[PDB]
Amino acid sequence: MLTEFDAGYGEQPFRDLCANYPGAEAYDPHDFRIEWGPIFHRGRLDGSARVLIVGQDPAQHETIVRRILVGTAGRRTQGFLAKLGIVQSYVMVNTFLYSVYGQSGGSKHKNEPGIVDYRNKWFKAVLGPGNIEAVVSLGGLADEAWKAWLKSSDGAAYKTLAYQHITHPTWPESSAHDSATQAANTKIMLAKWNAALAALAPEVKHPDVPTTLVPYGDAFKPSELVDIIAKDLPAGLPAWMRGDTPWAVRQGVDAAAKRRTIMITIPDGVIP
Amino acid sequence: MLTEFDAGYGEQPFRDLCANYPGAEAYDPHDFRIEWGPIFHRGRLDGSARVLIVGQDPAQHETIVRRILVGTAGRRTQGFLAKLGIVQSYVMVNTFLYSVYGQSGGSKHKNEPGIVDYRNKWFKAVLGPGNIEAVVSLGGLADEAWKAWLKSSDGAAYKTLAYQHITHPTWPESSAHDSATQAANTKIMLAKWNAALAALAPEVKHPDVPTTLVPYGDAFKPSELVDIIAKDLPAGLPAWMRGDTPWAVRQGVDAAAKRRTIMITIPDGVIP
Ligand SMILES: O=c1cc[nH]c(=O)[nH]1
Ligand SMILES: O=c1cc[nH]c(=O)[nH]1
């Protein structure tokens, strides 16, 4: 009928934010992939947001879509929020603007003023209206990011919020090699996720659709992997860039080659 | 004082346009690369527009920047407009939303009833404010596109509008293989261009900068290759995305793979 899209960052305070973002003076160019520029958010900036997701750092798919959480992690997160009856009314700022280069990480820089101060201005901007009913952090650094926000002047008012530390969507796969232990560490992730949902269900009193909580099983049921909605992607992008199939990856013979190149690859079935 | 960027298409009437665009029902999926989405424009949509550029079709350098004419062609067009003394005050629009898949030139469909009307839907919108001081078409289908606009109801008001059809900026390289023949067709494009500049310059009464008209020589002065300005690119996009060096190309072993894939590689010098 009509196809929805995220107009982007026209309205203040987001215009100045996207107009005045930090570079090498804050993010170390070797430890952070600043070469790809910053990806700022995913979701609503009009106030209709009820849940805030605090993620960790972008990847190759985010680098093309220019929105965060549009890969596997985001697709698992979508379903997580889908269980809360939340289908679009969300906001998702990543901790770090740029991706960590290695597991060396931003954790070497998690308390750097350049990173924290800027991130907090975004926190303040999305929470200002005060329509956020819950907060869900993805992983450890997201947690300390949310905590570091709360110990600040502007953050103190949000200590009563419904924050919830969550394990990082892809811990299973980055923690493990065999697929047995990965599934084993998937079962433990879903368990902790269920705990968080049980904790958050009562506090989200404005869902997009009223839905009674259906807990995760031992593994990811496909119904619980929801494609990113069109309203999240900028004008024109194709629906294969928000689908169930991977379409972006870094390529190179050595670590240097991989850092400079990305390959976009359209899934089979789009072209006749 | 910092970097700029294109908010996107959030103010009407452009958002509804970007929300209701034509797809396979208008652009033939075999002849057009509908697979990458439509790219809508480049430049100003706030009324500051002075020149309308009607280009032909997007390329790889337009599938990423999401803006049209951001490669060699755009950089030549950029240099062209600099001579009219306008450095930002422009609007750029293509004949086709999607790129042509082949050498034919997507002419077989140059008269569709879904392709043409939409292009005109944009024309009416960009001309609506009535501050457009000049029109420049790039190549044959660009030329025929402007004429097709003029033969319509809403277009009738613009037959008096200063218009110059010029050779498509990449005519030299798409014609021949030898450096010499490309070198031979060097002033044949400029000289023909100089006339259009001579013809429009007096009618471009509101430039961004008072500028002395300098006709083209026989070849492209490096100064006549102007990098695309930041305000044209969406928020966050790295400045290597709009530099003097190419950074995107199609790759594959057969024709099918090549249509599905795109390699982006960052130029040397971005990463220390
Ligand atoms: O943006 C992203 C992408 C993957 N994982 C995250 O935590 N954030
Ligand atoms: O946008 C573009 C890019 C290349 N050539 C064109 O005609 N238009």
- Provide the H-helix boundaries in B128-186: 140-150, 171-175, 179-184
To the nearest 10 degrees (0 to 180), the angle between helices B72-83 and B187-200 is: 40
The DSSP bridge pattern shows strands A90-94 and B163-166 to be unpaired
State the Cα–Cα distance between residues B169 and B241, nearest whole angstrom.
20
| Cα separations in angstroms, A217 against A114, A191, A213, A222, A224 | 41, 8, 12, 11, 10
Q: Best of B32, B42, B54, B57 to mutate for ligand 2, by most ligand atoms within 8 A of CB?
A: B57
The DSSP bridge pattern shows strands A134-138 and A90-94 to be unpaired
The residues, ordered by sequence, that sit 6+ positions from A140 with a Cβ below 8 Å of its Cβ are: A168
CB contact under 8 A, A2 and B20: yes
State the Cα–Cα distance between residues A172 and A185, nearest whole angstrom.
5
Ligand 1 centroid to Cα of residue A34, in Å, is 15
The DSSP bridge pattern shows strands A42-43 and A90-94 to be antiparallel
To the nearest 10 degrees (0 to 180), the angle between helices B140-150 and B115-127 is: 70
State the Cα–Cα distance between residues B155 and B52, nearest whole angstrom.
14
Asked if residues A18 and B5 have their Cβ atoms less than 8 Å apart, the reply is yes
What resolution in angstrom units was achieved for this structure?
Answer: 2.9
State the Cα–Cα distance between residues B20 and B2, nearest whole angstrom.
34
**How many other CB atoms are there within 10 angstroms of residue A176's CB atom?**
15
Asked if residues A91 and A52 have their Cβ atoms less than 8 Å apart, the reply is yes
**How many other CB atoms are there within 10 angstroms of residue A256's CB atom?**
10
Beta bridge partners of A262: A250, B264
Q: A56 in ligand 1 pocket by Cβ < 6 Å? A: yes
Asked if residues B110 and B229 have their Cβ atoms less than 8 Å apart, the reply is no
State the Cα–Cα distance between residues B210 and B226, nearest whole angstrom.
17
Tokens of B152: 């319509």
3-class secondary-structure state, position B53: strand
Q: How far is A200 from chain B (nearest CA, A)?
A: 33
Q: A62 in ligand 1 pocket by Cβ < 6 Å? A: yes
Ligand 1 centroid to Cα of residue A107, in Å, is 15
Residue A41 annotated as binding? no
**How many other CB atoms are there within 10 angstroms of residue B10's CB atom?**
17
| Cα separations in angstroms, B231 against A197, B29, B196, B261 | 42, 32, 27, 28
Amino acid at B229: I
CB contact under 8 A, B19 and A35: no
State the method: X-ray
Residues from A contacting B (CB-CB < 8 Å) are 2-5, 7-10, 15, 18-21, 29-30, 35-40, 64, 66, 234-238, 240, 251, 259-266, 270-272
Asked if residues B172 and B219 have their Cβ atoms less than 8 Å apart, the reply is no
Per-residue DSSP letter, A86: -
Q: How many CA atoms lie within 13 A of B34 on its CB side?
A: 18
Of A173, A129, A123, the residue nearest A145 (C-alpha) = A123
Q: Biggest alpha carbon distance in chain A?
A: 57
State the Cα–Cα distance between residues B143 and B37, nearest whole angstrom.
24
Residues from B contacting A (CB-CB < 8 Å) are 2-5, 7-11, 15, 18-21, 29-30, 35-40, 64, 66, 234-238, 240-241, 251, 256, 259-266, 270-272
